[PDB]
Every structure is written in C-alpha cells, then in structure tokens.
Amino acid sequence: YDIQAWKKQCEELLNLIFQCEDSEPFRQPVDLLEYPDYRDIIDTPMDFATVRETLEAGNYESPMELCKDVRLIFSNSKAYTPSKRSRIYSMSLRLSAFFEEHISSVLSDYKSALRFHKR
Numbered sequence: 001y002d003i004q005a006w007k008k009q010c011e012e013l014l015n016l017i018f019q020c021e022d023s024e025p026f027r028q029p030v031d032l033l034e035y036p037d038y039r040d041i042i043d044t045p046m047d048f049a050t051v052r053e054t055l056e057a058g059n060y061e062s063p064m065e066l067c068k069d070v071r072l073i074f075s076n077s078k079a080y081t082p083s084k085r086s087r088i089y090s091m092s093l094r095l096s097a098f099f100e101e102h103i104s105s106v107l108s109d110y111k112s113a114l115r116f117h118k119r
C-alpha cells in the first residue's frame, strides 16, 4: 500500500548493484579519453552514480523513471559494443538480468499502491 516504499527499495537495489563486480564499468560516466568516439554513437550517457544521485536528490517521481535510466545504461552498452561477445557488454547483460529480476516487484508494488490510492 505504501506509495513511497519504492525509494528505499531502489536505494537497496543500487547498493546491491554497486557490490556486484559486473557493475564496475557502469559505476561512473564512460571516460571519453578511453573511448574517444563514444558521443558519436551515444546521445545520452548514463551510469549508476548518476542514477543514485538523481534518486538521492529527490529527482525521481517514480521507480519507472529510475528503471528507464537504468535501462539506458544497458542499451548504451549494447549500442556501443563492437561485438555481442565483448567483455563489457557481457557484464552488462548479466547485470541487466539481475536488475530486471529485482526491479519487477518494486514496479509491481508501486503501481498496485498507486492504484489503491486512486481507487
């Protein structure tokens, strides 16, 4: 029933993601000195520190907004990868599976709580 519970749930999920070794390439913005043409392919950079900071600033209204930004981290990795077998891309697929497995109940509980609020 709690319309605000998603925020702490997302904080705890981001804590789990930061503990995951697979998140290391995604914890901070992609370095343009390491990948000079990054912005020629990727229009909207995103990373987990920017997601956490947006959440902690009170700049997400719902877990769907957070989920859209986290998914952008993974679609950027898929768009920039030179191969479907690359190391960083392979790490993003596992991390995406972990994130989707955990965010599902957060989204369901929030949407259910909001429907109850507007009943």
Ligand SMILES: Fc1ccccc1NCc1cc[nH]n1
Pocket (backbone or CB within 6 Å): 025, 026, 030, 035, 077, 078, 080, 081, 082, 086, 087, 088, 089
């Ligand atoms: F070299 C790559 C292979 C596959 C996906 C992404 C990259 N480089 C960009 C990046 C993203 C996060 N860390 N570095």
